[PDB]
DNA sequence: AAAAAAAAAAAAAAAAAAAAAAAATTTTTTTTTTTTTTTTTTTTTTT
């Protein structure tokens, strides 16, 4: 055999102290919930939270970060240990069972530039976007071989040296039996672990202004293989180590590093939101308690810094509570997200609602007419360059997938993407092909664009047709088309004023005592934990200065949030009632005797018209979780077509 | 697997808190002394007994017996550091050791810087600075173990164990931390050693020289080097526990420090200490593997029976006026009669006194001729295992080089060293030669040069020396003045028939089969220890002869001397038995000057020797 | 970790068959009794009979005698399990169990000249003479490290690699942590296990006459190192294999080939000796305790009419004393010695013979055929080491046993003197420079002399006939002058006895046929009812095995004398020594000293033993008695 | 709105910096064993 150690000291404290962090069960049970999870979901990654460990015993804490695979290795022993306790069973069934951390990284926490030799051995927490990901191969970790000369059935078990010195004996795979008969591997019988490799860049809005950006490998192993793909803005934690060189006989000193990644993370806010007993709990109260006018109190709480626009404000809650898509069972599928394009005179905050929807909405992204360019926007295809094959970058659209894209400058976008995304907008999805691929990529995004009218400055004495360039086959696919008009009114002057005004004087309590400024410059950014991938909530803003006083509370940002989340896998069917009303009211609306004279249409009605009435009835449903489209979802939403439709030419 | 920082600091709190009343029941601390001798340097070796141990932790010396080494050196490492807190005095210096651990712990202090780290290879070796030895003394438990018994399941244990000293090598020195002094540094190298052989290192460690980037030769020193007494003995089976069968079995010891020079050939020595084994590299082994031979550590050397090293009751035997017929009566009393025979064999053992106004000798030479079957044998055999230094040889089985010395390859080192004989173990003790007569004529010629020069001097080809045979002789044979003019006393034993004699004869000898005992008597025989004490203790009391006396022994000589000429042999070696006689009965009467009573009972003896051969 | 075997079909079978054989109780149970047997006495080998196994299982033998090796990896690890399965806590104490074979090994029984390439790898049984006997030393297989610097402990397996490949990986002891830190080995903790190296030579007897002598190689592991010693006859069943050479880039085809002993057992298989037998001579004892004595006396040596006093000897010579050993170490001997002084033809070498056969022991010597060194101890060096070694003699070996010197008249008076010490107190006493050594013999002499001028002139006395002196003579307890006595009715019994042994035949295995001229058959050396059937052609009687079992009993009943008895024998020796004893014209055969008080008492406590008595008693001192005056007198006529 | 020019990109080809792979028996030493010689010891023969 060969060296065995018996008495390790450290290794059995290291094991002591995580079983008995681990434990828990005296602690509130967190660890000991968190494993039992894990267990009845199936995972043998424990997600470890670094704070509630440097809690419990800070010397273990710091022994783990500053030498991570020993401390590692002994935490997993104890995991392993700790499930086989807890159910022995699924232990035996799973070899070996990972431990990743997270948390606050005091220094530990750094970028692809930051990250120095200094951090070798040690656990760091890496920032950055993924520029390129390899495909997930098998690496064996135990052969089986059968010798059909002899029915011998031998077993080969590879070590996990991928940061550890390794010798030819210990990476021979078995061809001969030791009489040279040949062999036979059983590929069924054989163990083996899926593995990749990315490759972590700083973050351009990071980076120093000018300079190339710094790189870092990283390797993913089991369970974290296909964890994110290229442009993944991903929290890498891992150890850092130096790769092993080939058998030499001459070294240069020179060692290729690399992250042994513990664990993944996307961007948090896309990420499922907790949702504890107290908080559905208060989503319930809210919903039951208030319908008849909560949808109109979610529209005037979306964005309280922008004063006015209720209409457009409603029109975009509906957008971002969307629709319910129509698969039909010979495949013909109906989107229902709405499409919503801002139009009107400048300083109306038009793209202050879309910073605001691109803050708020997951999967939102921004845009700008001459930002992206076609393959910029949707799909992409490209050559690997090393293989000869083709390949598919996904676009903004495809980015945005079940979520939206803000776009500003709209008028300025050129002809040609417009063209290009008018399949994005009504399909929802991207048709791409070269000679050597063809894919048809899934696009269900909600475009929220802005514009300005031609020459500037909105027409009253012109035709909308004639102030907005946008031709009729691009201006139909646009569900909603508000024109925001800067209104000389002297009252509503001032009551714009009056709210800007406040919006600028209010200051956040605590944090700013009345002459901080809070900007930070690159330092302070790593030095704290990211509010891009961290981990009570109450449910209607407490009065303060952003408005004087009414009886009429305004709803917490974050339970908004929830709110809407919960809300939009509602799927209301549509009532025959409803049905018969937007159907009179769509005839009505085409028949253009309806409308009075001295009015130009903004967009022209078609059956588009009647599925974004259908659409916004169902929003509304959503909106008040009823379930099921009724008269007053529907009177919501002729309501909202009526006033966008039309607009009234002054002379 | 335990806690070796545990087990210190248990080892600790016994040499320090551990106690007994060895001294007239006072509570003295033996241990806490002992520790205060050893670090004033008055006292090099420290005997830890296990029984003591055992008094309260008897699990510590279970562990101890099952890894002995390393509790040795944990027990070493506790004395070390607890002799600093007993210290009291200052040392005098006593070697020149004493100066180099002085002046390298002067130096060290001087260099100290307390607050930096020093590298491992950076200090003085513990051994280095030790000046003292630290052995167990095995448990009362353990029961003695057999050379044969001790086996592969005993390596690394503490055993104990028994036999006869066939061989040891001369105190030698063993290096333990070699020294090297560097020609460009000035710093000192320390090389410890565990394997018999080392290989002398070349180039200097020191810091300085290793930034210096110079050659940094360094050479071997024998001054600042650590060495230590090194014997090396072999220790054989005794007869009794041998099987049936088989010849004894030999064990390797090696004995080091103040054990040396306690055990010389041919002593009874129970012999406690480490079975450790010795790894065989060079040889091309027949069978692979780390195959090494074995030896025995030495501890506690202790002597045995006769290799062994009062009470007011005990001194009112010595001067009661029958202690002589006592000591006479109690040697051998399974043997019936031969009251004077007894008696010879006492003054025998007693001998004279030892004179160089040219030295002439003070040994009492005693040869028993006799009809078969008078109890000669069992009488020098009693004799062989009663005196404490004896050799017994029959017949030719030990014969030559048996009794001589003889030439013979070392091992320590590999040369011609000089091993003795049967003559050479009895030196300055007695050997008991049965079947003298049937005996070798070179044999008996170096008997012959024994008896009165007490040397042996061999001039063979790979010889020429004179070996120191300082012993008495008591022979035995059958049938002379070849023989009646050497020996002191010429002593016939005939069996003469008789109906009383042969039957009183007869019942003690039934007696003695039945009982496996000799018959009750008026006093109870002395035990072999006490006789060998009482022995002792006459050995040391040289008595002189007044000049009173000058004119009864002359007178009794030429009496004698008269009786010799006239009957159908006398001479002045017959006036020299009656002094060293006389002067043997002076010494077991506990008196310095003899008297006419001891003159008396010589000439009786010479009387009564003489009329057996008639 | 690396290439672990998942399912092995072979040794699977191999396993499960062993485990089978080893699990007895729908069988008779020997084996699961030895199993139990060996737990209780705390061993690690089991002896299995391969005739055994091959009756339950022919496969497993074959396969088990031509692949040693890794069957008996296989049968080993199946007695763990069933050791195990018997008491695990047992089992747990000893890492391994081993087995030893035994029994009759057809082709594979060979001599070390027959032991050729064609048995490499198989299991063989070689019976031979040992000649090297190695010092047993300890060869680690598992030891135990201690780094001070990091507190940390190793351990260090080493594979049994005798005769597999080894590669230096294997056998590199570490003394440096992975940093570089000393380690330092902890002798206490580390295992390790005795290890030996023997020679056997081909039987001088039995090798061929012309050649020179062919031996082996053997390695004994734990457990069978000290089994034998230089000299003595054993039977040795181990694997004969081929020992690898060393690391080098080339080789010859030579291989050095030598045996790993799985047992060893010795010659003296006779040297050793069931409840029915036990039942047997308790009852034998008891029923009649009287005439028992004759009754052994006289089947003693049945090919051999008459000498009724001398066949009494030999069984009191058989049958020993009591030694006494006293409170101060004196001893006082147990043994008996005889001296045969006789005419020629008489039966005296023949008696020698029939102890030879019979007693436990016995080691025959012959007048010039042992001369000093070869019948007693001896000294030599070892040549290699430099260093003096014991050997021993005839009668070292002889110890606690007989030794039948012929023609011990012939001896010459150096080696008659060397045997006094022997004769007396049952030791010699050797020493060398180097080397002095205590070794004991306590054996008894049993010696056939013929008298000066051939035969025993009856007109000349005792003394003048045995040209022996007295002081060798006392020495022998007793003494027989065995003459060819001219009667002419005497003669006629001598004559029909020997006819009719002569006539005898063996039942049923010889019908006409010659007796014949040994490896085909296993070595009856070495091979694993009270009265005789009463056969008219060999009586006109205890049976021989029954009296070896009766004997090897009563030795060790150790019966005390009782007063009664010592004050007759105490009577009867004054009266030996007074001259009354001995009329007229009878002449002592020997001088009657303390020596034959001895005597008295050696032959009552040797009758008391052959009556299992427990007290030797007046009938026994009358005995002995008897005896004493029929040996130490003789009747000289004019 | 269509044509021409500009450039922008994609992909393919090419040339170094570092790392990785390939190729590799012969001479001398020592140990064991075996034999020869010397001297001592023991044995045998003659007086
Ligand atoms: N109704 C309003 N209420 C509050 N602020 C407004 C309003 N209209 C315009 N603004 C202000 O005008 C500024 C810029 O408007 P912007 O979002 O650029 O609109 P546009 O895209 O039409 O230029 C914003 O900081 C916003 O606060
Ligand atoms: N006087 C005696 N008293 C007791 N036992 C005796 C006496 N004489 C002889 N013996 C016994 O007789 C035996 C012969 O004596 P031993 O000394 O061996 O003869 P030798 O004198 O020839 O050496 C011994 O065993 C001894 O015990
Ligand atoms: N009393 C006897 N009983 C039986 N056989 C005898 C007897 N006497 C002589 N013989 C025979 O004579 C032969 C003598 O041979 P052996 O005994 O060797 O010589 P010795 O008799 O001189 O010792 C033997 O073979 C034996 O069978
Ligand atoms: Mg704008
Ligand atoms: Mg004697
Ligand atoms: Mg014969
Ligand atoms: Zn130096």
């Given at each position: 055999?060969?060296?065995?150690?018996?008495?390790?000291?450290?290794?059995?404290?290291?094991?002591?102290?995580?079983?008995?962090?681990?434990?828990?069960?005296?602690?509130?049970?967190?660890?000991?919930?968190?494993?039992?999870?894990?267990?009845?979901?199936?995972?043998?990654?424990?997600?470890?939270?670094?704070?509630?460990?440097?809690?419990?015993?800070?010397?273990?804490?710091?022994?783990?970060?500053?030498?991570?695979?020993?401390?590692?290795?002994?935490?997993?022993?104890?995991?392993?240990?700790?499930?086989?306790?807890?159910?022995?069973?699924?232990?035996?069934?799973?070899?070996?069972?990972?431990?990743?951390?997270?948390?606050?990284?005091?220094?530990?926490?750094?970028?692809?530039?930051?990250?120095?030799?200094?951090?070798?051995?040690?656990?760091?927490?890496?920032?950055?976007?993924?520029?390129?990901?390899?495909?997930?191969?098998?690496?064996?970790?135990?052969?089986?071989?059968?010798?059909?000369?002899?029915?011998?059935?031998?077993?080969?078990?590879?070590?996990?040296?991928?940061?550890?010195?390794?010798?030819?004996?210990?990476?021979?795979?078995?061809?001969?039996?030791?009489?040279?008969?040949?062999?036979?591997?059983?590929?069924?019988?054989?163990?083996?672990?899926?593995?990749?490799?990315?490759?972590?860049?700083?973050?351009?809005?990071?980076?120093?202004?000018?300079?190339?950006?710094?790189?870092?490998?990283?390797?993913?192993?089991?369970?974290?293989?296909?964890?994110?793909?290229?442009?993944?803005?991903?929290?890498?934690?891992?150890?850092?180590?130096?790769?092993?060189?080939?058998?030499?006989?001459?070294?240069?000193?020179?060692?290729?590093?690399?992250?042994?990644?513990?664990?993944?993370?996307?961007?948090?806010?896309?990420?499922?939101?907790?949702?504890?007993?107290?908080?559905?709990?208060?989503?319930?109260?809210?919903?039951?308690?208030?319908?008849?006018?909560?949808?109109?109190?979610?529209?005037?709480?979306?964005?309280?810094?922008?004063?006015?626009?209720?209409?457009?404000?409603?029109?975009?809650?509906?957008?971002?509570?969307?629709?319910?898509?129509?698969?039909?069972?010979?495949?013909?599928?109906?989107?229902?997200?709405?499409?919503?394009?801002?139009?009107?005179?400048?300083?109306?905050?038009?793209?202050?609602?879309?910073?605001?929807?691109?803050?708020?909405?997951?999967?939102?992204?921004?845009?700008?007419?001459?930002?992206?360019?076609?393959?910029?926007?949707?799909?992409?295809?490209?050559?690997?360059?090393?293989?000869?094959?083709?390949?598919?970058?996904?676009?903004?659209?495809?980015?945005?997938?079940?979520?939206?894209?803000?776009?500003?400058?709209?008028?300025?976008?050129?002809?040609?993407?417009?063209?290009?995304?008018?399949?994005?907008?009504?399909?929802?999805?991207?048709?791409?092909?070269?000679?050597?691929?063809?894919?048809?990529?899934?696009?269900?995004?909600?475009?929220?664009?802005?514009?300005?009218?031609?020459?500037?400055?909105?027409?009253?004495?012109?035709?909308?047709?004639?102030?907005?360039?946008?031709?009729?086959?691009?201006?139909?696919?646009?569900?909603?088309?508000?024109?925001?008009?800067?209104?000389?009114?002297?009252?509503?002057?001032?009551?714009?004023?009056?709210?800007?005004?406040?919006?600028?004087?209010?200051?956040?309590?605590?944090?700013?005592?009345?002459?901080?400024?809070?900007?930070?410059?690159?330092?302070?950014?790593?030095?704290?934990?990211?509010?891009?991938?961290?981990?009570?909530?109450?449910?209607?803003?407490?009065?303060?200065?952003?408005?004087?006083?009414?009886?009429?509370?305004?709803?917490?940002?974050?339970?908004?949030?929830?709110?809407?989340?919960?809300?939009?896998?509602?799927?209301?069917?549509?009532?025959?009632?409803?049905?018969?009303?937007?159907?009179?009211?769509?005839?009505?609306?085409?028949?253009?005797?309806?409308?009075?004279?001295?009015?130009?249409?903004?967009?022209?009605?078609?059956?588009?018209?009647?599925?974004?009435?259908?659409?916004?009835?169902?929003?509304?449903?959503?909106?008040?979780?009823?379930?099921?489209?009724?008269?007053?979802?529907?009177?919501?939403?002729?309501?909202?077509?009526?006033?966008?439709?039309?607009?009234?030419?002054?002379? | 697997?335990?806690?070796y920082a545990?087990e210190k600091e248990?080892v600790k709190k016994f040499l320090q808190?551990?106690?007994?009343?060895?001294?007239?029941?006072?509570?003295?601390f033996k241990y806490g002394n002992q520790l205060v001798r050893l670090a004033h340097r008055e006292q090099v070796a420290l005997y830890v007994?296990?029984?003591?141990?055992?008094?309260?932790?008897?699990?510590?010396?279970?562990?101890?017996?099952?890894?002995?080494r390393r509790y040795a050196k944990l027990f070493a490492d506790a004395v070390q550091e607890l002799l600093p807190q007993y210290k009291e005095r200052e040392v005098v210096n006593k070697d020149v050791l004493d100066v180099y651990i002085e002046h390298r712990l002067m130096m060290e202090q001087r260099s100290r810087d307390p607050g930096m780290v020093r590298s491992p290879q950076n200090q003085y070796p513990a051994e280095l600075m030790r000046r003292f030895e630290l052995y167990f003394?095995?448990?009362?438990?353990?029961?003695?173990?057999?050379?044969?018994?001790?086996?592969?399941?005993?390596?690394?244990?503490?055993?104990?164990?028994?036999?006869?000293?066939?061989?040891?090598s001369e105190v030698k020195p063993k290096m333990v931390v070699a020294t090297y002094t560097c020609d460009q540094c000035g710093a000192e190298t320390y090389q410890p050693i565990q394997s018999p052989t080392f290989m002398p290192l070349i180039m200097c460690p020191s810091q300085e020289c290793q930034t210096n980037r110079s050659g940094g030769r360094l050479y071997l020193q024998t001054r600042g080097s650590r060495f230590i007494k090194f014997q090396e003995?072999?220790?054989?089976?005794?007869?009794?526990?041998?099987?049936?069968?088989?010849?004894?079995?030999?064990?390797?010891?090696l004995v080091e420090g103040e054990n040396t020079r306690i055990?010389?050939?041919?002593?009874?020595?129970?012999?406690?200490?480490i079975?450790?084994?010795?790894?065989?590299?060079?040889?091309?082994?027949?069978?692979?593997?780390?195959?090494?031979?074995?030896?025995?550590e030495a501890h506690?050397?202790?002597?045995?029976?006769?290799?062994?090293?009062?009470?007011?009751?005990?001194?009112?035997?010595?001067?009661?006026?029958?202690?002589?017929?006592?000591?006479?009566?109690?040697?051998?009393?399974?043997?019936?009669?031969?009251?004077?025979?007894?008696?010879?064999?006492?003054?025998?053992?007693?001998?004279?006194?030892?004179?160089?106004?040219?030295?002439?000798?003070?040994?009492?030479?005693?040869?028993?001729?006799?009809?078969?079957?008078?109890?000669?044998?069992?009488?020098?055999?009693?004799?062989?295992?009663?005196?404490?230094?004896?050799?017994?040889?029959?017949?030719?089985?030990?014969?030559?080089?048996?009794?001589?010395?003889?030439?013979?390859?070392?091992?320590v080192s590999?040369?011609?060293?000089?091993?003795?004989?049967?003559?050479?173990?009895?030196?300055?003790?007695?050997?008991?030669?049965?079947?003298?007569?049937?005996?070798?004529?070179?044999?008996?010629?170096?008997?012959?040069?024994?008896?009165?020069?007490?040397?042996?001097?061999?001039?063979?080809?790979?010889?020429?020396?004179?070996?120191?045979?300082?012993?008495?002789?008591?022979?035995?044979?059958?049938?002379?003045?070849?023989?009646?003019?050497?020996?002191?006393?010429?002593?016939?034993?005939?069996?003469?028939?008789?109906?009383?004699?042969?039957?009183?004869?007869?019942?003690?000898?039934?007696?003695?089969?039945?009982?496996?005992?000799?018959?009750?008597?008026?006093?109870?025989?002395?035990?072999?220890?006490?006789?060998?004490?009482?022995?002792?203790?006459?050995?040391?009391?040289?008595?002189?002869?007044?000049?009173?006396?000058?004119?009864?022994?002359?007178?009794?000589?030429?009496?004698?001397?008269?009786?010799?000429?006239?009957?159908?042999?006398?001479?002045?070696?017959?006036?020299?038995?009656?002094?060293?006689?006389?002067?043997?009965?002076?010494?077991?009467?506990?008196?310095?000057?003899?008297?006419?009573?001891?003159?008396?009972?010589?000439?009786?003896?010479?009387?009564?020797?003489?009329?057996?051969?008639?």
């Amino acid at each position: 055999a060969g060296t065995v150690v018996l008495d390790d000291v450290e290794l059995r404290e290291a094991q002591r102290d995580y079983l008995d962090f681990l434990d828990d069960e005296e602690d509130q049970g967190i660890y000991q919930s968190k494993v039992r999870e894990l267990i009845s979901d199936n995972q043998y990654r424990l997600i470890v939270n670094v704070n509630d460990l440097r809690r419990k015993n800070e010397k273990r804490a710091n022994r783990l970060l500053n030498n991570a695979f020993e401390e590692l290795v002994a935490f997993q022993r104890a995991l392993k240990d700790f499930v086989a306790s807890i159910d022995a069973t699924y232990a035996k069934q799973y070899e070996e069972f990972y431990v990743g951390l997270e948390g606050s990284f005091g220094s530990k926490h750094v970028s692809p530039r930051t990250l120095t030799s200094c951090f070798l051995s040690c656990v760091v927490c890496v920032e950055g976007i993924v520029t390129k990901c390899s495909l997930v191969r098998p690496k064996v970790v135990r052969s089986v071989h059968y010798c059909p000369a002899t029915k011998k059935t031998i077993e080969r078990r590879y070590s996990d040296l991928t940061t550890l010195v390794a010798f030819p004996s210990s990476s021979v795979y078995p061809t001969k039996d030791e009489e040279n008969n040949p062999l036979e591997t059983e590929y069924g019988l054989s163990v083996y672990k899926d593995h990749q490799t990315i490759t972590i860049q700083e973050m351009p809005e990071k980076a120093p202004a000018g300079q190339l950006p710094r790189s870092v490998d990283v390797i993913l192993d089991d369970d974290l293989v296909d964890k994110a793909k290229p442009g993944d803005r991903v929290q890498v934690v891992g150890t850092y180590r130096c790769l092993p060189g080939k058998k030499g006989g001459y070294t240069s000193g020179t060692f290729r590093t690399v992250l042994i990644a513990c664990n993944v993370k996307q961007m948090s806010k896309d990420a499922q939101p907790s949702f504890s007993a107290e908080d559905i709990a208060k989503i319930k109260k809210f919903s039951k308690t208030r319908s008849k006018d909560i949808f109109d109190q979610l529209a005037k709480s979306l964005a309280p810094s922008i004063h006015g626009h209720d209409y457009v404000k409603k029109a975009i809650l509906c957008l971002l509570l969307g629709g319910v898509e129509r698969d039909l069972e010979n495949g013909s599928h109906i989107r229902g997200d709405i499409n919503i394009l801002l139009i009107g005179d400048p300083s109306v905050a038009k793209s202050q609602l879309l910073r605001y929807v691109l803050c708020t909405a997951p999967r939102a992204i921004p845009t700008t007419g001459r930002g992206s360019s076609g393959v910029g926007l949707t799909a992409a295809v490209t050559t690997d360059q090393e293989t000869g094959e083709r390949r598919l970058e996904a676009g903004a659209m495809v980015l945005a997938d079940r979520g939206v894209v803000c776009i500003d400058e709209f008028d300025k976008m050129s002809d040609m993407d417009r063209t290009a995304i008018h399949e994005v907008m009504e399909q929802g999805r991207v048709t791409i092909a070269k000679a050597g691929i063809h894919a048809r990529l899934n696009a269900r995004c909600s475009v929220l664009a802005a514009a300005n009218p031609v020459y500037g400055r909105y027409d009253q004495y012109k035709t909308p047709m004639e102030n907005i360039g946008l031709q009729d086959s691009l201006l139909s696919r646009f569900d909603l088309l508000f024109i925001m008009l800067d209104q000389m009114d002297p009252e509503q002057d001032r009551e714009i004023s009056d709210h800007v005004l406040r919006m600028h004087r209010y200051r956040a309590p605590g944090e700013q005592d009345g002459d901080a400024m809070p900007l930070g410059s690159a330092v302070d950014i790593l030095a704290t934990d990211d509010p891009n991938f961290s981990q009570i909530y109450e449910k209607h803003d407490n009065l303060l200065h952003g408005t004087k006083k009414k009886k009429e509370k305004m709803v917490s940002a974050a339970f908004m949030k929830k709110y809407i989340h919960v809300a939009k896998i509602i799927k209301p069917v549509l009532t025959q009632e409803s049905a018969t009303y937007i159907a009179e009211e769509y005839s009505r609306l085409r028949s253009q005797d309806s409308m009075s004279s001295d009015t130009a249409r903004t967009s022209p009605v078609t059956a588009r018209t009647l599925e974004t009435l259908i659409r916004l009835a169902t929003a509304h449903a959503k909106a008040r979780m009823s379930k099921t489209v009724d008269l007053q979802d529907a009177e919501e939403a002729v309501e909202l077509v009526q006033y966008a439709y039309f607009k009234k030419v002054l002379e | 697997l335990k806690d070796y920082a545990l087990e210190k600091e248990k080892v600790k709190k016994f040499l320090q808190e551990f106690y007994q009343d060895d001294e007239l029941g006072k509570k003295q601390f033996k241990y806490g002394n002992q520790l205060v001798r050893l670090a004033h340097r008055e006292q090099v070796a420290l005997y830890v007994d296990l029984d003591d141990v055992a008094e309260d932790d008897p699990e510590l010396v279970d562990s101890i017996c099952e890894n002995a080494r390393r509790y040795a050196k944990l027990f070493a490492d506790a004395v070390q550091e607890l002799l600093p807190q007993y210290k009291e005095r200052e040392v005098v210096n006593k070697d020149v050791l004493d100066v180099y651990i002085e002046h390298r712990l002067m130096m060290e202090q001087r260099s100290r810087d307390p607050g930096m780290v020093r590298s491992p290879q950076n200090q003085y070796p513990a051994e280095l600075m030790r000046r003292f030895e630290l052995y167990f003394q095995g448990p009362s438990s353990n029961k003695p173990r057999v050379i044969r018994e001790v086996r592969a399941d005993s390596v690394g244990k503490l055993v104990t164990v028994r036999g006869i000293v066939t061989r040891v090598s001369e105190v030698k020195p063993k290096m333990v931390v070699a020294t090297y002094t560097c020609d460009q540094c000035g710093a000192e190298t320390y090389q410890p050693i565990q394997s018999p052989t080392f290989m002398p290192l070349i180039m200097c460690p020191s810091q300085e020289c290793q930034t210096n980037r110079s050659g940094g030769r360094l050479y071997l020193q024998t001054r600042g080097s650590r060495f230590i007494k090194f014997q090396e003995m072999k220790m054989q089976e005794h007869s009794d526990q041998v099987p049936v069968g088989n010849i004894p079995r030999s064990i390797t010891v090696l004995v080091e420090g103040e054990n040396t020079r306690i055990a010389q050939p041919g002593d009874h020595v129970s012999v406690t200490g480490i079975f450790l084994p010795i790894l065989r590299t060079g040889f091309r082994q027949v069978v692979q593997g780390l195959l090494s031979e074995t030896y025995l550590e030495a501890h506690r050397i202790v002597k045995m029976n006769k290799s062994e090293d009062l009470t007011r009751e005990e001194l009112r035997q010595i001067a009661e006026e029958d202690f002589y017929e006592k000591l006479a009566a109690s040697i051998a009393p399974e043997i019936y009669g031969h009251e004077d025979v007894k008696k010879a064999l006492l003054l025998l053992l007693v001998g004279g006194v030892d004179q160089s106004p040219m030295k002439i000798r003070g040994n009492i030479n005693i040869c028993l001729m006799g009809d078969p079957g008078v109890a000669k044998s069992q009488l020098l055999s009693y004799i062989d295992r009663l005196a404490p230094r004896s050799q017994y040889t029959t017949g030719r089985g030990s014969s030559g080089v048996g009794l001589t010395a003889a030439v013979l390859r070392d091992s320590v080192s590999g040369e011609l060293t000089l091993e003795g004989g049967a003559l050479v173990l009895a030196d300055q003790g007695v050997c008991c030669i049965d079947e003298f007569d049937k005996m070798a004529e070179a044999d008996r010629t170096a008997i012959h040069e024994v008896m009165e020069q007490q040397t042996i001097s061999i001039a063979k080809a790979g010889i020429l020396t004179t070996l120191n045979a300082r012993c008495s002789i008591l022979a035995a044979a059958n049938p002379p003045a070849a023989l009646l003019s050497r020996f002191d006393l010429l002593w016939l034993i005939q069996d003469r028939p008789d109906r009383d004699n042969d039957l009183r004869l007869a019942q003690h000898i039934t007696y003695v089969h039945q009982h496996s005992r000799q018959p009750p008597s008026q006093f109870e025989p002395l035990d072999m220890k006490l006789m060998r004490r009482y022995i002792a203790m006459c050995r040391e009391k040289q008595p002189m002869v007044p000049e009173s006396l000058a004119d009864y022994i002359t007178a009794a000589y030429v009496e004698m001397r008269r009786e010799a000429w006239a009957s159908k042999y006398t001479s002045a070696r017959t006036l020299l038995a009656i002094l060293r006689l006389s002067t043997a009965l002076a010494r077991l009467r506990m008196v310095d000057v003899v008297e006419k009573e001891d003159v008396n009972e010589a000439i009786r003896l010479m009387e009564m020797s003489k009329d057996s051969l008639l």
